[PDB]
Structures are given as structure tokens and as C-alpha cells.
Tab-separated table of C-alpha atoms and ligand atoms in Angstrom:
chain	number	residue	atom	x	y	z
A	1	UNK	CA	-0.786	15.863	-20.054
A	2	UNK	CA	1.902	13.730	-21.207
A	3	UNK	CA	5.652	12.335	-20.940
A	4	UNK	CA	8.177	15.177	-19.829
A	5	UNK	CA	10.935	13.713	-21.944
A	6	UNK	CA	11.840	10.833	-24.200
A	7	UNK	CA	14.681	8.807	-23.179
A	8	UNK	CA	17.279	7.863	-25.827
A	9	UNK	CA	17.493	4.164	-25.557
A	10	UNK	CA	21.071	4.310	-27.571
A	11	UNK	CA	22.398	6.454	-24.644
A	12	UNK	CA	21.535	4.593	-21.553
A	13	UNK	CA	24.538	3.614	-19.617
A	14	UNK	CA	25.604	-0.258	-19.196
A	15	UNK	CA	27.556	0.628	-16.044
A	16	UNK	CA	26.180	2.139	-12.685
A	17	UNK	CA	27.640	5.229	-11.199
A	18	UNK	CA	30.170	5.228	-8.434
A	19	UNK	CA	29.114	4.649	-4.674
A	20	UNK	CA	30.456	5.852	-1.366
A	21	UNK	CA	33.900	4.237	-0.510
A	22	UNK	CA	33.314	0.952	1.053
A	23	UNK	CA	29.895	0.049	-0.728
A	24	UNK	CA	29.046	-1.602	-3.901
A	25	UNK	CA	25.853	-2.102	-5.908
A	26	UNK	CA	24.126	-5.408	-5.551
A	27	UNK	CA	20.970	-7.066	-7.342
A	28	UNK	CA	18.870	-8.946	-4.642
A	29	UNK	CA	17.299	-12.304	-5.626
A	30	UNK	CA	14.342	-12.391	-3.293
A	31	UNK	CA	13.985	-16.038	-4.266
A	32	UNK	CA	16.899	-16.874	-2.150
A	33	UNK	CA	15.636	-17.135	1.302
A	34	UNK	CA	18.658	-15.719	3.075
A	35	UNK	CA	18.496	-12.448	0.858
A	36	UNK	CA	14.816	-12.064	1.637
A	37	UNK	CA	16.050	-12.336	5.170
A	38	UNK	CA	18.395	-9.527	4.652
A	39	UNK	CA	16.000	-7.120	3.312
A	40	UNK	CA	13.643	-7.827	6.247
A	41	UNK	CA	16.494	-7.496	8.568
A	42	UNK	CA	17.061	-3.976	7.117
A	43	UNK	CA	13.608	-2.886	6.756
A	44	UNK	CA	12.621	-4.074	10.213
A	45	UNK	CA	14.908	-1.729	11.851
A	46	UNK	CA	15.371	1.038	9.301
A	47	UNK	CA	12.175	1.445	7.422
A	48	UNK	CA	9.276	4.127	7.995
A	49	UNK	CA	8.501	5.646	11.278
A	50	UNK	CA	6.254	8.070	12.871
A	51	UNK	CA	7.696	11.340	13.986
A	52	UNK	CA	7.569	10.385	17.728
A	53	UNK	CA	9.631	7.248	17.035
A	54	UNK	CA	6.639	5.200	18.496
A	55	UNK	CA	6.078	2.911	15.603
A	56	UNK	CA	8.104	1.238	12.675
A	57	UNK	CA	6.524	-0.514	9.742
A	58	UNK	CA	7.197	-4.126	10.040
A	59	UNK	CA	6.508	-5.788	6.570
A	60	UNK	CA	6.558	-9.541	6.846
A	61	UNK	CA	8.690	-11.932	4.698
A	62	UNK	CA	5.724	-13.144	3.328
A	63	UNK	CA	4.309	-9.636	2.456
A	64	UNK	CA	7.809	-8.875	0.685
A	65	UNK	CA	7.536	-12.211	-1.337
A	66	UNK	CA	4.093	-11.060	-2.273
A	67	UNK	CA	4.722	-7.316	-2.889
A	68	UNK	CA	7.873	-7.547	-5.058
A	69	UNK	CA	7.334	-11.028	-6.974
A	70	UNK	CA	4.255	-9.789	-8.696
A	71	UNK	CA	3.490	-10.219	-12.397
A	72	UNK	CA	6.228	-9.148	-14.865
A	73	UNK	CA	8.655	-8.695	-12.040
A	74	UNK	CA	12.450	-8.514	-12.597
A	75	UNK	CA	15.173	-9.281	-9.952
A	76	UNK	CA	17.073	-6.111	-11.847
A	77	UNK	CA	14.469	-3.904	-10.159
A	78	UNK	CA	15.412	-5.205	-6.718
A	79	UNK	CA	18.439	-2.991	-5.966
A	80	UNK	CA	20.616	-3.420	-3.000
A	81	UNK	CA	23.877	-1.725	-1.744
A	82	UNK	CA	26.145	-3.800	0.389
A	83	UNK	CA	29.331	-3.095	2.488
A	84	UNK	CA	32.312	-4.461	0.499
A	85	UNK	CA	33.909	-5.923	3.499
A	86	UNK	CA	31.530	-7.393	5.501
A	87	UNK	CA	28.733	-7.983	2.764
A	88	UNK	CA	26.013	-6.237	4.792
A	89	UNK	CA	23.040	-5.194	3.144
A	90	UNK	CA	22.827	-1.507	4.118
A	91	UNK	CA	20.253	-0.081	1.656
A	92	UNK	CA	17.779	-0.654	-0.805
A	93	UNK	CA	15.172	0.544	-3.676
A	94	UNK	CA	12.799	-1.488	-5.283
A	95	UNK	CA	10.205	-1.435	-8.251
A	96	UNK	CA	7.574	-3.854	-9.772
A	97	UNK	CA	5.873	-3.206	-13.228
A	98	UNK	CA	2.228	-2.252	-13.809
A	99	UNK	CA	0.080	-0.317	-16.060
A	100	UNK	CA	-1.781	2.760	-15.063
A	101	UNK	CA	-4.550	4.803	-16.234
A	102	UNK	CA	-3.839	8.470	-15.965
A	103	UNK	CA	-6.866	10.462	-17.233
A	104	UNK	CA	-7.472	7.610	-19.922
A	105	UNK	CA	-3.951	7.413	-21.188
A	106	UNK	CA	-2.633	4.252	-20.225
A	107	UNK	CA	1.050	3.832	-19.034
A	108	UNK	CA	3.388	1.357	-18.432
A	109	UNK	CA	5.251	2.276	-15.300
A	110	UNK	CA	7.323	0.970	-12.340
A	111	UNK	CA	5.932	1.246	-8.880
A	112	UNK	CA	8.834	2.156	-6.539
A	113	UNK	CA	8.936	1.121	-2.976
A	114	UNK	CA	10.941	0.179	-0.339
A	115	UNK	CA	13.617	2.897	-0.367
A	116	UNK	CA	15.629	2.441	2.600
A	117	UNK	CA	19.052	3.553	3.900
A	118	UNK	CA	20.472	2.045	7.218
A	119	UNK	CA	20.344	4.774	9.992
A	120	UNK	CA	24.145	4.865	10.081
A	121	UNK	CA	24.196	6.050	6.444
A	122	UNK	CA	21.566	8.793	6.475
A	123	UNK	CA	22.119	12.520	5.297
A	124	UNK	CA	25.060	11.344	3.157
A	125	UNK	CA	23.064	12.070	-0.226
A	126	UNK	CA	22.764	8.235	-0.948
A	127	UNK	CA	19.053	8.783	-2.119
A	128	UNK	CA	19.625	10.481	-5.381
A	129	UNK	CA	22.200	7.722	-6.062
A	130	UNK	CA	19.813	5.075	-5.440
A	131	UNK	CA	17.213	6.983	-7.318
A	132	UNK	CA	19.541	7.372	-10.440
A	133	UNK	CA	20.582	3.750	-10.556
A	134	UNK	CA	16.862	2.152	-10.465
A	135	UNK	CA	16.004	4.574	-13.059
A	136	UNK	CA	18.741	3.346	-15.294
A	137	UNK	CA	17.970	-0.196	-14.690
A	138	UNK	CA	14.244	0.633	-15.808
A	139	UNK	CA	15.390	2.561	-18.845
A	140	UNK	CA	17.260	-0.456	-19.991
A	141	UNK	CA	14.372	-2.341	-19.642
A	142	UNK	CA	12.104	-0.254	-21.689
A	143	UNK	CA	10.119	1.643	-18.815
A	144	UNK	CA	10.547	5.499	-18.777
A	145	UNK	CA	7.956	6.561	-16.134
A	146	UNK	CA	7.129	5.768	-12.616
A	147	UNK	CA	4.549	6.174	-9.680
A	148	UNK	CA	5.352	6.330	-6.079
A	149	UNK	CA	4.053	7.614	-2.847
A	150	UNK	CA	5.928	9.059	0.079
A	151	UNK	CA	4.911	10.852	3.375
A	152	UNK	CA	7.452	13.845	2.588
A	153	UNK	CA	6.488	16.707	0.194
A	154	UNK	CA	8.717	16.687	-2.915
A	155	UNK	CA	8.307	18.543	-6.063
A	156	UNK	CA	5.214	18.472	-8.098
A	157	UNK	CA	2.706	16.137	-6.058
A	158	UNK	CA	-0.251	14.620	-8.182
A	159	UNK	CA	-2.423	14.197	-5.104
A	160	UNK	CA	-2.405	13.887	-1.280
A	161	UNK	CA	-4.380	11.649	1.064
A	162	UNK	CA	-4.929	11.378	4.639
A	163	UNK	CA	-4.406	7.988	6.828
A	164	UNK	CA	-7.625	6.932	8.868
A	165	UNK	CA	-7.612	4.266	11.659
A	166	UNK	CA	-10.556	2.159	12.974
A	167	UNK	CA	-9.647	0.784	16.274
A	168	UNK	CA	-10.685	-2.860	16.467
A	169	UNK	CA	-8.990	-3.804	19.752
A	170	UNK	CA	-9.217	-0.237	21.410
A	171	UNK	CA	-7.432	-1.197	24.624
A	172	UNK	CA	-4.339	-2.628	22.808
A	173	UNK	CA	-4.142	0.627	20.860
A	174	UNK	CA	-4.600	2.686	23.822
A	175	UNK	CA	-1.842	0.707	25.933
A	176	UNK	CA	0.846	1.082	22.954
A	177	UNK	CA	-0.158	4.829	22.804
A	178	UNK	CA	-1.717	4.559	19.428
A	179	UNK	CA	-5.036	5.625	20.340
A	180	UNK	CA	-5.440	8.319	23.208
A	181	UNK	CA	-8.073	8.095	25.811
A	182	UNK	CA	-10.163	11.472	25.546
A	183	UNK	CA	-10.361	13.433	28.168
A	184	UNK	CA	-13.750	13.279	29.536
A	185	UNK	CA	-13.754	9.188	29.037
A	186	UNK	CA	-12.882	5.745	30.264
A	187	UNK	CA	-11.516	2.614	29.069
A	188	UNK	CA	-14.879	1.007	29.126
A	189	UNK	CA	-16.453	4.015	27.164
A	190	UNK	CA	-13.952	3.755	24.429
A	191	UNK	CA	-14.417	0.062	24.160
A	192	UNK	CA	-18.390	0.426	23.862
A	193	UNK	CA	-17.900	3.202	21.233
A	194	UNK	CA	-15.741	0.792	19.056
A	195	UNK	CA	-17.831	-2.426	19.523
A	196	UNK	CA	-18.707	-4.106	16.459
A	197	UNK	CA	-21.485	-7.073	15.703
A	198	UNK	CA	-20.163	-10.684	15.659
A	199	UNK	CA	-21.738	-11.598	12.573
A	200	UNK	CA	-21.576	-9.757	8.972
A	201	UNK	CA	-24.716	-8.324	7.460
A	202	UNK	CA	-24.179	-8.309	3.818
A	203	UNK	CA	-26.218	-11.390	2.059
A	204	UNK	CA	-23.999	-13.614	0.103
A	205	UNK	CA	-20.718	-12.212	1.481
A	206	UNK	CA	-18.285	-15.195	1.402
A	207	UNK	CA	-14.512	-15.261	0.820
A	208	UNK	CA	-13.234	-14.935	-2.870
A	209	UNK	CA	-12.567	-18.101	-4.711
A	210	UNK	CA	-10.004	-18.408	-7.912
A	211	UNK	CA	-13.401	-19.195	-9.948
A	212	UNK	CA	-14.261	-15.451	-9.205
A	213	UNK	CA	-11.197	-13.968	-10.801
A	214	UNK	CA	-12.910	-13.055	-13.997
A	215	UNK	CA	-15.960	-11.454	-12.748
A	216	UNK	CA	-14.117	-9.593	-10.037
A	217	UNK	CA	-11.616	-8.684	-12.632
A	218	UNK	CA	-14.382	-7.162	-14.644
A	219	UNK	CA	-16.217	-5.275	-11.835
A	220	UNK	CA	-12.939	-3.911	-10.495
A	221	UNK	CA	-11.841	-2.505	-13.873
A	222	UNK	CA	-15.229	-0.870	-14.096
A	223	UNK	CA	-15.213	0.514	-10.745
A	224	UNK	CA	-11.827	1.947	-10.871
A	225	UNK	CA	-12.458	3.897	-14.342
A	226	UNK	CA	-14.222	6.142	-12.267
A	227	UNK	CA	-10.984	7.610	-10.861
A	228	UNK	CA	-8.520	9.903	-13.201
A	229	UNK	CA	-5.773	7.934	-11.647
A	230	UNK	CA	-6.112	4.288	-11.351
A	231	UNK	CA	-4.168	0.889	-11.695
A	232	UNK	CA	-5.158	-0.975	-14.793
A	233	UNK	CA	-5.438	-4.370	-13.694
A	234	UNK	CA	-4.693	-7.541	-15.598
A	235	UNK	CA	-6.272	-10.980	-14.940
A	236	UNK	CA	-2.646	-12.276	-13.602
A	237	UNK	CA	-2.754	-9.046	-11.287
A	238	UNK	CA	-6.137	-9.911	-9.994
A	239	UNK	CA	-4.713	-13.568	-9.104
A	240	UNK	CA	-1.673	-12.140	-7.534
A	241	UNK	CA	-2.949	-9.321	-5.557
A	242	UNK	CA	-6.508	-10.698	-4.496
A	243	UNK	CA	-6.216	-14.374	-4.049
A	244	UNK	CA	-4.460	-15.913	-1.201
A	245	UNK	CA	-2.810	-19.268	-1.922
A	246	UNK	CA	-2.651	-21.276	1.437
A	247	UNK	CA	-1.018	-24.103	-0.270
A	248	UNK	CA	2.020	-22.089	-0.819
A	249	UNK	CA	1.810	-18.941	1.536
A	250	UNK	CA	1.848	-20.041	5.167
A	251	UNK	CA	1.507	-16.669	6.571
A	252	UNK	CA	-1.471	-15.188	4.711
A	253	UNK	CA	-1.072	-11.437	3.814
A	254	UNK	CA	-4.186	-10.650	1.580
A	255	UNK	CA	-7.859	-11.282	2.317
A	256	UNK	CA	-10.603	-10.825	-0.146
A	257	UNK	CA	-14.441	-11.196	0.181
A	258	UNK	CA	-17.053	-11.164	-2.502
A	259	UNK	CA	-20.753	-10.751	-2.390
A	260	UNK	CA	-22.485	-13.610	-4.353
A	261	UNK	CA	-26.096	-12.135	-5.041
A	262	UNK	CA	-28.404	-14.598	-3.378
A	263	UNK	CA	-30.970	-14.436	-6.494
A	264	UNK	CA	-28.731	-14.066	-9.357
A	265	UNK	CA	-25.400	-15.508	-8.051
A	266	UNK	CA	-23.434	-12.967	-9.852
A	267	UNK	CA	-20.773	-11.410	-7.703
A	268	UNK	CA	-22.076	-7.936	-7.041
A	269	UNK	CA	-19.442	-6.462	-4.768
A	270	UNK	CA	-16.161	-7.264	-3.385
A	271	UNK	CA	-13.441	-5.889	-0.896
A	272	UNK	CA	-10.066	-6.742	0.312
A	273	UNK	CA	-7.643	-5.919	2.828
A	274	UNK	CA	-4.041	-6.909	3.913
A	275	UNK	CA	-2.073	-7.523	6.865
A	276	UNK	CA	0.820	-4.923	7.637
A	277	UNK	CA	2.262	-4.909	11.189
A	278	UNK	CA	4.005	-1.940	12.880
A	279	UNK	CA	6.497	-2.641	15.689
A	280	UNK	CA	6.053	-0.797	18.742
A	281	UNK	CA	9.408	0.700	19.177
A	282	UNK	CA	9.691	0.845	23.127
A	283	UNK	CA	6.222	-0.621	24.855
A	284	UNK	CA	6.401	-2.719	28.152
A	285	UNK	CA	3.277	-4.884	27.540
A	286	UNK	CA	3.114	-5.110	23.556
A	287	UNK	CA	5.243	-5.331	20.873
A	288	UNK	CA	3.085	-5.229	17.681
A	289	UNK	CA	0.206	-3.274	16.234
A	290	UNK	CA	-1.390	-5.694	13.830
A	291	UNK	CA	-3.061	-3.515	11.214
A	292	UNK	CA	-5.161	-4.567	8.366
A	293	UNK	CA	-5.241	-2.116	5.524
A	294	UNK	CA	-8.272	-1.590	3.180
A	295	UNK	CA	-6.902	-2.420	-0.392
A	296	UNK	CA	-9.223	-2.661	-3.264
A	297	UNK	CA	-12.913	-2.919	-3.627
A	298	UNK	CA	-15.894	-2.273	-6.021
A	299	UNK	CA	-19.778	-2.412	-5.851
A	300	UNK	CA	-22.333	-2.613	-8.863
A	301	UNK	CA	-24.093	0.029	-6.800
A	302	UNK	CA	-21.810	2.804	-7.937
A	303	UNK	CA	-23.086	2.553	-11.546
A	304	UNK	CA	-26.437	3.998	-10.876
A	305	UNK	CA	-24.439	7.351	-9.744
A	306	UNK	CA	-27.051	7.360	-7.082
A	307	UNK	CA	-24.405	8.672	-4.281
A	308	UNK	CA	-27.077	8.344	-1.667
A	309	UNK	CA	-27.520	4.451	-2.599
A	310	UNK	CA	-23.485	4.252	-2.870
A	311	UNK	CA	-22.911	5.402	0.714
A	312	UNK	CA	-25.498	2.987	2.213
A	313	UNK	CA	-24.092	0.126	0.449
A	314	UNK	CA	-20.572	0.972	1.439
A	315	UNK	CA	-21.527	1.388	5.053
A	316	UNK	CA	-22.838	-2.174	5.238
A	317	UNK	CA	-19.716	-3.600	3.314
A	318	UNK	CA	-17.018	-1.795	5.206
A	319	UNK	CA	-18.638	-2.559	8.341
A	320	UNK	CA	-18.516	-6.024	7.460
A	321	UNK	CA	-14.735	-5.919	6.681
A	322	UNK	CA	-14.206	-4.324	10.017
A	323	UNK	CA	-16.017	-7.407	11.626
A	324	UNK	CA	-13.887	-9.863	9.397
A	325	UNK	CA	-10.716	-8.173	10.341
A	326	UNK	CA	-11.480	-8.237	13.996
A	327	UNK	CA	-12.131	-11.820	13.543
A	328	UNK	CA	-8.860	-12.369	12.250
A	329	UNK	CA	-7.232	-10.858	15.204
A	330	UNK	CA	-6.218	-7.376	13.702
A	331	UNK	CA	-5.998	-4.439	16.065
A	332	UNK	CA	-6.619	-1.704	13.870
A	333	UNK	CA	-8.424	-1.032	10.299
A	334	UNK	CA	-6.498	1.501	8.383
A	335	UNK	CA	-7.575	3.341	5.105
A	336	UNK	CA	-6.747	6.308	3.222
A	337	UNK	CA	-9.277	9.110	1.824
A	338	UNK	CA	-8.745	7.765	-1.703
A	339	UNK	CA	-11.317	5.528	-3.751
A	340	UNK	CA	-14.887	6.588	-2.322
A	341	UNK	CA	-13.843	6.160	1.119
A	342	UNK	CA	-14.904	9.642	2.311
A	343	UNK	CA	-18.396	8.203	2.297
A	344	UNK	CA	-17.788	5.974	4.877
A	345	UNK	CA	-14.702	6.840	7.073
A	346	UNK	CA	-16.083	9.152	9.831
A	347	UNK	CA	-19.477	7.261	10.169
A	348	UNK	CA	-17.891	3.795	10.805
A	349	UNK	CA	-15.736	5.478	13.651
A	350	UNK	CA	-12.317	5.823	11.569
A	351	UNK	CA	-10.299	8.396	13.641
A	352	UNK	CA	-8.257	10.952	11.569
A	353	UNK	CA	-4.452	10.034	11.554
A	354	UNK	CA	-1.412	11.984	11.457
A	355	UNK	CA	0.240	10.465	8.472
A	356	UNK	CA	-0.288	11.642	5.028
A	357	UNK	CA	0.525	10.197	1.450
A	358	UNK	CA	1.865	12.217	-1.046
A	359	UNK	CA	1.433	10.607	-4.809
A	360	UNK	CA	4.111	11.455	-7.651
A	361	UNK	CA	4.606	10.722	-11.173
A	362	UNK	CA	8.246	10.422	-12.777
A	363	UNK	CA	8.333	11.819	-16.241
A	364	UNK	CA	4.665	12.134	-16.662
A	365	UNK	CA	3.137	15.769	-16.412
A	366	UNK	CA	-0.680	15.589	-15.363
A	367	UNK	CA	-3.116	18.401	-13.734
A	368	UNK	CA	-3.535	17.385	-9.815
A	369	UNK	CA	-6.106	15.023	-8.848
A	370	UNK	CA	-8.375	15.311	-5.841
A	371	UNK	CA	-7.496	13.230	-3.041
A	372	UNK	CA	-10.787	12.965	-1.032
A	373	UNK	CA	-9.962	15.848	1.290
A	374	UNK	CA	-10.600	19.572	1.548
A	375	UNK	CA	-8.378	22.362	2.583
A	376	UNK	CA	-8.718	21.386	6.297
A	377	UNK	CA	-7.405	17.831	5.271
A	378	UNK	CA	-10.702	16.717	6.336
A	379	UNK	CA	-12.732	13.866	4.088
A	380	UNK	CA	-15.050	15.516	1.563
A	381	UNK	CA	-17.442	13.731	-0.654
A	382	UNK	CA	-16.835	16.422	-3.545
A	383	UNK	CA	-13.174	15.704	-3.583
A	384	UNK	CA	-13.261	12.116	-4.663
A	385	UNK	CA	-12.950	10.857	-8.131
A	386	UNK	CA	-9.308	11.404	-8.230
A	387	UNK	CA	-7.119	8.617	-6.586
A	388	UNK	CA	-7.979	4.764	-7.564
A	389	UNK	CA	-4.437	3.369	-6.866
A	390	UNK	CA	-3.563	1.870	-3.685
A	391	UNK	CA	0.185	0.961	-3.303
A	392	UNK	CA	1.765	-0.955	-0.370
B	1	MYA	C1	11.747	5.365	-15.018
B	1	MYA	C2	11.922	4.847	-13.672
B	1	MYA	C3	12.289	5.821	-12.462
B	1	MYA	C4	12.136	5.165	-11.284
B	1	MYA	C5	12.462	6.460	-10.084
B	1	MYA	C6	11.313	7.000	-9.784
B	1	MYA	C7	11.545	7.896	-8.523
B	1	MYA	C8	11.705	7.243	-7.233
B	1	MYA	C9	12.019	8.188	-6.055
B	1	MYA	C10	11.784	7.586	-4.598
B	1	MYA	C11	10.528	6.779	-4.179
B	1	MYA	C12	10.569	6.199	-2.723
B	1	MYA	C13	9.335	5.585	-2.320
B	1	MYA	C14	9.334	5.134	-0.993
B	1	MYA	O1	9.839	4.029	-0.837
B	1	MYA	S1	8.865	6.124	0.417
B	1	MYA	C15	9.455	5.537	1.689
B	1	MYA	C16	10.989	5.769	2.132
B	1	MYA	N1	11.628	5.289	3.150
B	1	MYA	C17	11.482	5.719	4.403
B	1	MYA	O2	11.052	6.549	4.726
B	1	MYA	C18	12.240	4.851	5.416
B	1	MYA	C19	13.177	5.710	6.423
B	1	MYA	N2	14.017	6.546	5.873
B	1	MYA	C20	15.133	6.286	5.129
B	1	MYA	O3	15.549	5.036	5.079
B	1	MYA	C21	15.830	7.619	4.532
B	1	MYA	O4	15.817	8.510	5.448
B	1	MYA	C22	15.771	7.611	3.180
B	1	MYA	C23	16.384	6.714	2.286
B	1	MYA	C24	14.168	7.904	2.732
B	1	MYA	C25	16.412	9.102	2.878
B	1	MYA	O5	17.745	8.911	2.916
B	1	MYA	P1	18.475	10.408	3.798
B	1	MYA	O6	17.405	10.780	4.749
B	1	MYA	O7	19.736	9.719	4.447
B	1	MYA	O8	18.611	11.482	2.667
B	1	MYA	P2	19.866	11.579	1.728
B	1	MYA	O9	20.737	12.482	2.398
B	1	MYA	O10	20.084	10.130	1.052
B	1	MYA	O11	19.196	12.271	0.399
B	1	MYA	C26	18.181	13.219	0.530
B	1	MYA	C27	17.467	13.522	-0.593
B	1	MYA	O12	16.543	12.437	-0.881
B	1	MYA	C28	15.318	13.043	-1.177
B	1	MYA	N3	14.226	12.282	-0.483
B	1	MYA	C29	14.250	11.867	1.055
B	1	MYA	N4	13.084	11.190	0.976
B	1	MYA	C30	12.512	10.484	-0.083
B	1	MYA	C31	11.691	9.956	-0.317
B	1	MYA	N5	10.977	9.269	0.592
B	1	MYA	N6	11.415	9.902	-1.900
B	1	MYA	C32	12.073	10.459	-2.784
B	1	MYA	N7	13.310	11.104	-2.310
B	1	MYA	C33	13.336	11.352	-1.053
B	1	MYA	C34	15.549	14.291	-0.020
B	1	MYA	O13	14.389	15.118	-0.353
B	1	MYA	C35	16.843	14.880	-0.583
B	1	MYA	O14	16.589	15.403	-1.831
B	1	MYA	P3	17.328	16.921	-1.978
B	1	MYA	O15	17.401	17.852	-0.604
B	1	MYA	O16	18.577	16.516	-2.892
B	1	MYA	O17	16.241	17.490	-3.094
B	2	75S	C1	1.201	3.312	12.970
B	2	75S	C2	2.400	3.637	12.354
B	2	75S	N1	3.320	2.607	12.078
B	2	75S	C3	4.479	2.901	11.311
B	2	75S	C4	4.781	4.216	11.058
B	2	75S	C5	3.764	5.337	11.454
B	2	75S	C6	2.516	4.950	11.925
B	2	75S	C7	1.464	6.099	12.152
B	2	75S	O1	0.437	6.495	10.977
B	2	75S	C8	1.247	6.696	9.778
B	2	75S	C9	1.168	5.610	8.754
B	2	75S	CL1	0.027	4.371	9.114
B	2	75S	C10	1.782	5.578	7.653
B	2	75S	C11	2.568	6.698	7.428
B	2	75S	C12	3.529	6.807	5.984
B	2	75S	C13	3.471	7.853	5.507
B	2	75S	C14	4.359	8.043	4.114
B	2	75S	N2	4.869	7.015	3.671
B	2	75S	C15	4.642	5.771	4.213
B	2	75S	N3	5.206	4.534	3.705
B	2	75S	C16	5.536	4.588	2.285
B	2	75S	C17	4.527	4.212	1.317
B	2	75S	N4	4.061	2.903	1.960
B	2	75S	C18	3.360	3.065	3.266
B	2	75S	C19	4.637	3.259	4.070
B	2	75S	C20	4.088	5.784	5.416
B	2	75S	C21	2.834	7.634	8.311
B	2	75S	C22	2.286	7.637	9.494
B	2	75S	CL2	2.331	8.970	10.711
């Protein structure tokens, strides 16, 4: 396990490659609100859909601000293509820097995201061109490896994880065609199945505060060390990725909650989730699915390696996260089979999803890592330990 090739810094081109006639390269400045608007305009109509063209991801402008201007960010890695005459933004590809651990080798990488071509420009082989240009921009800045996820199979996947969905407002989900009504059942019976308590159960549960950063940083790092592939968080990354700033962010995107032990007052667990809507492409009575996605978490209980005790602790914590998300008006709680999630998905009534996320490394070779599923693509507790990075 190691890099595939060494990039010769002396030979990185200062000029980008040629584009389709009528189009030109443009760095995006997402500090300019009109440019953030442009990116949002493009993703809102042209980003990731299911196969039935029912749903499209609808990242908010707030989410994009948050996802793309994280610690160590560079505008140079926010790449646009525009039409030369009208100036219209027609494609994008983006990165932000982070460090990852790949089987206890630490690597400086770009996370690549928000690859997007306007529907009218599809099937013209612009993707490889986008990919080559961001690669060039990264090489110039001293970064030679990447990580990304996609829902399509490409060469040499590192892992593969299945999406799971816990209805919070079952009837909303049923009405937009997201959740089916099985079959021998009724609306009343699905609502009953999905009922949650009105209050949380874990003692000392409260929202995270800025004062919690150093302890959450420590516990998260220890927790994530238990996975072959994981994100190697810095303290700035804990602040950015976990601690909502209501002063400065009007439309909250991240929620995080800690458990302050009632006896010792040390934080013993935490969990977090983020706000990511999908647009309901063509439905009478609703227009959006308001999803919360489980993000990072950690529990002291993990380090006993009592798998029994770990499941019990995660059942309570995750049910609390469901309750908190319902309380914040989310329709669905979404999670993948990564981390230790196969311990709690099926019992907390998450339904298996159609979507799958495939994980890839650029210019780094490593053995595959388990992604929390077996050969039937069902959660498996003996197939965890592999993926400990959640990309947005
Ligand atoms: C050191 C630093 C390096 C940094 C770079 C690391 C690599 C990063 C790589 C990317 C990380 C992205 C992470 C995310 O953001 S994943 C999300 C991607 N976005 C969407 O799904 C939004 C909706 N779709 C679109 O906007 C377009 O359909 C896209 C742009 C996806 C393809 O446009 P189009 O449909 O018009 O295709 P084409 O004719 O231009 O080109 C076809 C070629 O493109 C290859 N392809 C298709 N889909 C993907 C895909 N998701 N990852 C990598 N490659 C992909 C494809 O196999 C074919 O290759 P080949 O037939 O020649 O083999
Ligand atoms: C509810 C919904 N909203 C928008 C699109 C698709 C769906 C249905 O369930 C999913 C979900 Cl939630 C996600 C995906 C998916 C698959 C592969 N890549 C992605 N993206 C690229 C990586 N970031 C997440 C978006 C999404 C695919 C499906 Cl089928």
C-alpha cells in the first residue's frame, strides 16, 4: 500500500488544456454571493438524481458555503466552466484539503465533490477534461492524491456502502413516493411503526458547545482510529465541521450533541447530523424531502471492545438522534453502512435504500476495506472496521 506514481513538480503545466468551442475555464470565488448563487443554480437543476428521476439533491447555499470553505480551502480548487458569450456557469468540479489515514499511513489529499455538467452538455466527454484540470490545479499546490465517492462503479473501488433511511414523517415520504405503503398495511400502521418518543433518553445529552471541541476532538480521533480508512481530524476541522455558528450562519446546516456524564462531567459520547434536502422533481402536494444525514459520532463504550455493550449504547444514542432530528422538522434520517452503523440500522427501523456509495482513492493503492455489508448488500457486523470517513 502506497502511492502509484511520483509527480514531477518541474513538469506540471502552468496552462490548462483546451475546452469545447464556446467555453472557458473559470475559478469560482464562493465568497462572492452572485457566484455562490451561480453554483447553486447549476446544482439545483443538474446535480445527482435517482434512476427514476423522482428526486434531486438540493444542497443549500449555506451548505455549499460550509462544505467548500473548510480549513485550508483554496479558491483554485473551486473550478467552473462558463459559456464565453453569455457567461453562464455550465459545469463544476471542486475540492477541499484534508488528511486521511489509510491503514495508519497519514496522507494529505483533496476530497473531490460537486462534479456537475449542465444536462445540455452531457455525453461530450467533458468529465475527463474537468478531472484533468482539477488534478493539475492540485499538483501545482503540492497535493498528489485524492479521495472521492460516487454512486457509479469506476476502476478499482476501495469500498462500497449502502444508503439506509429512517422515516421521521412517514406520510410526507409516502406522499412524495419515497416510502411505499406495504402491501398488507395502512397509513395508520406505518405511522405507528415509525413513532418515536417525544424526549431523548441518554443522560447528560445536550447540544455541543465550543468549549467541547478539545474533548470531542480527542474522543473522535480515538474512535476513528478503529477504522482502516478514516478522516484524520484537526482541531479547526472539529470546529468547522461540528460547531454551528448561529451568529454567522442563518440557515443551520450542522447539528452536534454531546453527552456530558452526569457524575464525572466528561463528555463520553457525541453524534452529529446535517441538513441536506432533495427536490421532489414532480409531485403535487410536496416539493422537498428534508433529510438529515448522520455524520460523525463517537462513544467511550467502543474501547471496551464489548460489541454487546457497544450495540446497546448506540441504540440509545441513535434513537435520541432520530428524536432530535424529528424535533427539528426533518422528514427522514439517512445513514450509510460505514462506521458501526450495521449495529443499529435495522433495529432502529432504517429501511434499506436503492443508493450505494462507492469509495475511491486517486494515486494511492490499498487493499479493499469492508463497507459494513455482506455479499447480499445487507448490513453485517463482521464487515465493519473499514470505512470511517463520511463525505458530503
Ligand atoms: C491529485 C488530485 C486529483 C483529483 C482528481 C481525483 C479524481 C476525481 C474524479 C471525480 C470525482 C467526482 C465526485 C462526485 O462529485 S460524484 C457526483 C457526480 N455528479 C453527478 O452525478 C451529477 C449528475 N451528473 C452529471 O452532472 C454528469 O453526468 C457527470 C458530470 C457525472 C458525467 O458527465 P457525462 O455524463 O456527460 O459524461 P462525460 O461524457 O463528460 O464523460 C464520461 C466519463 O466520465 C466518467 N464519469 C462519469 N461519472 C463519473 C463520476 N461520478 N466520477 C468520475 N468519473 C465519472 C465516465 O465513466 C466516463 O468515463 P470513460 O467512459 O472515459 O471511462
Ligand atoms: C432521496 C434521493 N435524493 C436525491 C437523489 C437520490 C435519492 C435516492 O437515494 C439515494 C441517495 Cl440518498 C444518494 C445517492 C447517491 C449515490 C451516489 N452519489 C451520490 N452523491 C455523490 C456523493 N455525495 C452524495 C451525493 C448520491 C443515490 C440514491 Cl438512489
